[PDB]
Structure formats: C-alpha cells, structure tokens
Design an enzyme around this catalytic site. Sequence first.
Site, short mmCIF file in Angstrom:
data_model
loop_
_atom_site.label_atom_id
_atom_site.label_comp_id
_atom_site.label_asym_id
_atom_site.label_seq_id
_atom_site.Cartn_x
_atom_site.Cartn_y
_atom_site.Cartn_z
N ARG A 88 4.51 2.27 -2.20
CA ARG A 88 4.85 3.49 -3.08
C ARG A 88 6.04 4.33 -2.44
O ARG A 88 6.91 4.44 -3.36
CB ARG A 88 3.52 4.39 -2.88
CG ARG A 88 2.28 3.89 -3.13
CD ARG A 88 1.04 4.67 -3.28
NE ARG A 88 -0.07 3.95 -3.65
CZ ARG A 88 -0.25 3.27 -4.98
NH1 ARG A 88 0.56 3.71 -5.88
NH2 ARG A 88 -1.01 2.55 -4.95
N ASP A 98 0.93 -1.27 0.13
CA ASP A 98 0.18 -0.12 0.06
C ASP A 98 0.86 1.33 -0.07
O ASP A 98 2.05 1.38 -0.73
CB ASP A 98 -1.14 -0.04 1.16
CG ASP A 98 -2.20 0.92 0.97
OD1 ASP A 98 -3.03 0.66 0.31
OD2 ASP A 98 -1.91 2.08 1.42
N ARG A 99 0.57 2.02 0.97
CA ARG A 99 1.52 3.28 0.84
C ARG A 99 2.86 2.89 1.08
O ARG A 99 3.57 3.75 0.30
CB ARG A 99 1.14 4.45 2.07
CG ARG A 99 -0.43 4.88 2.16
CD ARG A 99 -1.00 4.99 1.01
NE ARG A 99 -0.61 6.36 0.61
CZ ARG A 99 -1.19 6.99 -0.81
NH1 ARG A 99 -1.97 5.99 -1.40
NH2 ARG A 99 -0.67 8.06 -1.13
N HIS A 112 -11.17 6.98 -2.39
CA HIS A 112 -10.35 7.81 -1.19
C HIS A 112 -9.10 8.41 -1.93
O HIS A 112 -8.65 9.37 -1.12
CB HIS A 112 -9.99 6.84 -0.28
CG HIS A 112 -9.28 5.75 -0.78
ND1 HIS A 112 -9.68 4.71 -1.63
CD2 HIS A 112 -7.99 5.33 -0.21
CE1 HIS A 112 -8.56 3.99 -1.80
NE2 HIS A 112 -7.30 4.15 -0.92
N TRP A 113 -8.55 8.02 -2.99
CA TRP A 113 -7.65 8.75 -3.53
C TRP A 113 -7.80 10.26 -3.80
O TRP A 113 -7.10 11.20 -3.54
CB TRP A 113 -7.10 8.11 -4.90
CG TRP A 113 -6.11 7.09 -4.48
CD1 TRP A 113 -6.33 6.04 -3.61
CD2 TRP A 113 -4.98 6.85 -5.20
NE1 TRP A 113 -5.12 5.21 -3.57
CE2 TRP A 113 -4.46 5.84 -4.60
CE3 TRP A 113 -4.41 7.58 -6.07
CZ2 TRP A 113 -3.20 5.43 -4.89
CZ3 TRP A 113 -3.03 7.19 -6.59
CH2 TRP A 113 -2.55 6.04 -5.69
N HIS A 139 -6.97 -6.78 -0.47
CA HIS A 139 -5.75 -6.00 -0.59
C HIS A 139 -4.71 -6.32 0.48
O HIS A 139 -3.38 -6.09 0.33
CB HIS A 139 -6.18 -4.72 -0.37
CG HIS A 139 -5.26 -3.56 -0.39
ND1 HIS A 139 -4.46 -3.42 -1.33
CD2 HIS A 139 -4.77 -2.58 0.55
CE1 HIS A 139 -3.71 -2.20 -1.14
NE2 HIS A 139 -4.21 -1.94 0.09
#
Lengths: 298, 297
Positions: free
Chosen positions: A113, A109-110, A154-155, A279
């Site tokens: 990134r 997830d984040r 949500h992005w 996810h």
Amino acid sequence: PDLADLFPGFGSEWINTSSGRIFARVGGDGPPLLLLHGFPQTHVMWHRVAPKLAERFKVIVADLPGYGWSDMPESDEQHTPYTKRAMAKQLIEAMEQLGHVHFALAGHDRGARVSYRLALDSPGRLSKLAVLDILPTYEYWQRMNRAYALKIYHWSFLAQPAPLPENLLGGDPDFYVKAKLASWTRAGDLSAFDPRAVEHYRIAFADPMRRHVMCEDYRAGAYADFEHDKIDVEAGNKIPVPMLALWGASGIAQSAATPLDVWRKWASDVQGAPIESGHFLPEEAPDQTAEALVRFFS
Amino acid sequence: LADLFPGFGSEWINTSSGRIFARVGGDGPPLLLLHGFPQTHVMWHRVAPKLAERFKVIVADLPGYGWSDMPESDEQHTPYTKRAMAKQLIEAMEQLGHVHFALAGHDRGARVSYRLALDSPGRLSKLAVLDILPTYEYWQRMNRAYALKIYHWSFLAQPAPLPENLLGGDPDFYVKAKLASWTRAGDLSAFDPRAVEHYRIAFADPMRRHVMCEDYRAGAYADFEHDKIDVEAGNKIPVPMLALWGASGIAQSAATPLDVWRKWASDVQGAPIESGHFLPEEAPDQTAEALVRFFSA
C-alpha cells in the site's frame, strides 16, 4: 532466545529521515530494490527471497515507519505519519539518504500500500513496482460486504478509535500475531514460517507502542488512505510505472476480485500471476515469489 | 448484585436447551422482554415496572446470557442462532402457559424477536423491536462506514478463540466500551451503576463471553442465512409490530428504519426516540410510553 540474523551478509543500516530512522538490511549490488513488508510482520519476512534478489540488485529490506526497528513518528488525529502517502514520502527520503532517487520497489501487505501510493504520488521515483497480495485500499473498502467484512475484519477492528484495538490486542498479543500469521497462510498454521522469523514478528508485536502504530496504520487505512485513493480513482490517475501484481491463490486479495483485473484499472502497465500460497507469498512460496520478482525486475 | 425489579418474582424456566432466567411481575396479558448485548434482562429495569402496571411482564435473560443456562454451541452456533433462541423462548413461555404473548426485544433480543415472529408468528400478539434492523439488512448494508460503525459484527464473529482471547485480557474494559460507545452521550451516565454491575459481572465470565461470540457468529452466518431466505422469499412478519429506534442508535446509521421494516413486516409502526442504542435505559419514559401504548392498543 535472541532474534538473530536472517540475512547473512546483509548490512544493517539506520537510515535517517525527517520523521525518524528507517531500519534496513542492505545487501547485494546492482540497481537498488526496496522491499517493504506489511502487517503483522517486519522486514525479516523477506528473508527467503532477499538472497535471490541480492544476486542482481542492491536490495534494501526496510522496516516500515513505526514497524519493526524503525522509529515510530508521533501520530496525530489524522494518523498522518501512518498514511501510506506519508510513509512513502518518508521512504523516499530514506532512499535519498542512500543516494537512490530512482529504484525498484516490491511491497507486501501494508508495504504494498505504501508502494502503490508511492507510485501514484511520485512515479518518477520508481523504475518498476511489484505489489504482493493486495488490492488498493479503495478497492477493499468499495467491495466491503458481508464476505469481505468477515474476511478482513481487522481492517475495521484495528481502525476503531484508540484505545479499543490496543486494549484488545493487549489481551493476548502473542496469540493475535500468530493467529494472523497462521490464518492467512495456505496451511493454516505457522509451518510455512521460519520460527526465527515468527520470533521477530512476535517480539515486535509484544510492544504496545508497535501495536499502537499498526492500529494507526489501519486507522489511516480506513480514512486518509482511502480518501487519497479516492481522489486518484475519481481523477482517473493511473500508476504509470510498470508493475507486477502477485497474489496468493488462497490469500486476501484474490477473491475481493480477480487482482489483475482490479489493478489494470489502477495501472497502465501491470502484469500479474497467482502464486500457490496464502497471503505471505515471500515465505509461503519463496522460490516462486523470488523467481517472479527477479524476472520482472531483471 | 442489586435487585433492580423490587416486587418482581424470579423464575428459572426449564427448556429442552437449558433454563431461562426471568424476572416476572405484573398481571395482565403476557409480555416478554428480551435484552441484547452486552446486557442481561436488567436493562429493562427502568421500563418493566411501568409495563407491569398493565401486563404480566416476563423479563428473560436470553439463552446463554445473564443467568440463563448456556447450551453448548456447535460448529453452526445453532443454540445461539436467533431461530434456536426463539424456539427456546417459545418453550419457556409455554412452560408458563403463554402460547400467545406480546414480545419486545432489544438488540440481540430484538433479533430473536423478529425471528420468532417469522418462524412462529402465531405465538405473538404483538411485536416490538428496539433499535435494530434485521441482521440481513445490516450485512447487506455492510459498506466502509457501516463496517467501521458496527465493526463488532465482524470482529465478534471471528472463529473462536480469537475474540474470546482478546476479550479475556480485560473484559471490564470491553463491556464498558460497548455500553458507553452506543449511548448518545458516549459514556456510562445513562445507566444505573447497579445495572452496569450486572452487565460487567455477566461479561466477566469467559463462558458468557464465548456465548456472546457464538451469538455474533450465528449473526454472521446462520442468522443471516435464515433472514436471507425470508427476504428473498418475500416472507414478512404478519404480526403487528412496533419498530423503535434511537435517533443516535445503531439501526438508523444503516438506513431509514421504518422503510426497512416495512419490507419485512406487513404491519409495522415506527418511532424514533431521542436516545442512543440503549432505548430503555437512555430514554426509559419514552420507551415505556411507546411500548405501553403499542401493546395496550
């Protein structure tokens, strides 16, 4: 109802950086492996996979800058400390504090990134990269369409200027964090999670300052992260670090596009596998995830 | 709540799907005005009286909005699809003996309006839509910039009770945020404070809020499917229409509005108005002039 310890034996380190402390659970021995969680979670999301990783690696399970128990650097107009570029620099500095200048990295997830941004910016820092259930931020935004806008609403929601998301998240933070957890699982409820981990995520999400950070992260995700990625696509910059892309067969990154095809555009050496999960791969399918990671990281 | 239409009557119009609340004034040909979100019929209070000098103006709360009844929704958000809302407003107008009327809509109301125009063009003498493109076009143009700009299209369409739960912590903040955010000034100064109070009070009701989400869920699903069929079939609104949009409004951010509308409508006139989203409140005189001229032509 205390939080309690989901990593028996792991130490707890506060790692100093120039932008604030990184919190980490550290266990295991062998080559260093940094594990990075994402949203709306904390490092404890690795609790089912870290033990199997710590059998061969010095596993560092870090709270992202601003998340969990890591300090929250003051943000700015450009969301700079919550750009994945900044976060990667901070974690690099964190790992340097432990003497790891070259390490394995797995991000979800984040955190994923951060991890591929880390690989682009500072590929010499990584022996191997694994990213869990993401496509690059640029890919989500390019493929933005009705279907994706509804799926990853949500992005854009969280990327709205403060204080809009913060105030709305404020409306029912417990509901929201559990809603996000449940809704991106395969089961569609919280059954995949250890309730003690859900409690960690809930407590972190109860904090307005933590929620503001997450918004900052997503704000960065809509702007600077995207711009940074765009420079790399347009420059044809590829990740040179061997990477593994795992995705949930029923998750977020799987039907924006076929994730191995996308990552092959971004990385010169990627392998990938679907994992029977939503996810939250390390918690929905810990054995399968852990086994994939251990095999790839060796 | 203030009476923002001194001299207008009030009607509660029964329909099969619930009562439609309207303010009614004026005389002449029938002109139905439909508000959008997060408003009620009172958004027309600055232009309706000028319209009422030439038309029988019916200023209706959309189904589920304002003081109109709220039909129970369902899995497909049927009552809050623009197709259903259109049918319900047709039935309401038929209750007044208006089977052929002029129609102007703003925001969600404009979506009802062009859907009405597509489903039942024979009901409309003329159609004006204020600061929208078709739902299909917003979704088709749903890239990074636009997803950020109309994030609420996808936020409010999330499955219940997510938006409802978030909205319920501080309803006043959100209705104020959306009113202010879409004006050219980015504040509430365009609005009559009495009209804001109407908007805020309607938004303070969790059922009303749910209805709004249902509207947006319809806007993400059924409404889009309905528009999709029409645009892929090459169905065009055959009723003379006026597209008005705010130079700083929503519709222009997506595309050149007149170009888009000429794909949907065989007879469309367009004009930008120096205004944010809320044309009849930010730019009442220009809006009223544009509508008066178009409808009385």
